[PDB]
Amino acid sequence: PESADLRALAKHLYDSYIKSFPLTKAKARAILTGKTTDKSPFVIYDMNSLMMGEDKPLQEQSKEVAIRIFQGCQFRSVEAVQEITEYAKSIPGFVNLDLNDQVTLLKYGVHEIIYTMLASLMNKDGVLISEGQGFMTREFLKSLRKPFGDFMEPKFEFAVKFNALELDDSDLAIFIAVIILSGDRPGLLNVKPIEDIQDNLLQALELQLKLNHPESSQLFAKLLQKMTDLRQIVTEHVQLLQVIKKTETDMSLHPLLQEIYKDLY
């Protein structure tokens, strides 16, 4: 009965996730594998293939190129933000929380979730861009001038490890709900009901991983460590902000590469 209720919670979350997120992990992987009906993504793997790509314009200045990238990617994240917000409303107990706390939890949580989404678009070789119609290689991105060449590499490093857990959508639904109901965000008024919902979600997650991945070893534990890696990845992004503001001049970047980065995070 306890276990039945943990299974029912997992199902509720999964159904709600499918309703809220059009871009699922299964859909990303079907594009990355080829199972998909339609023709494959165009591969950008060098400057020539970059120029030969145009599936997507004003003249950007030197010491602004990087900040304009971070700002632009954050603005294009809004539909994800809205999707996550919608999913969050379906998490039992969440809308009965203090409005102030709902907003806080999302303000911090969304960035961690956006990285989990980013991982679904990646493999060890590259990342899907331009609504899944393009594929930009990891090798190419790593080859670009300092500081840009170090922008994406750590997200690939995380994504290879995270994707090695082999989570599916039904697992990810509960994972993301666990990330959102973090009782340690700064400024929370009433933590008790938050940590209480998250404890229930943690139960549900444990059982889901046992049932969906009976073969695995410390999958629960390994997955919980990824919250740290996401945390860590989010806290860091600032360290990129301040390598920029004083870098060995200049920060020219080809306009198609600036366009591509605004699709990342």
Binding site: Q74, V81, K89
Partner: peptide, 14 residues
């Protein structure tokens, strides 16, 4: 442009 992430979220919650 004075409306940030919280505005998007608050709007979406309402």
């Amino acid at each position: 442009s004075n409306l940030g992430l919280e505005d998007i979220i608050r709007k979406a919650l309402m």
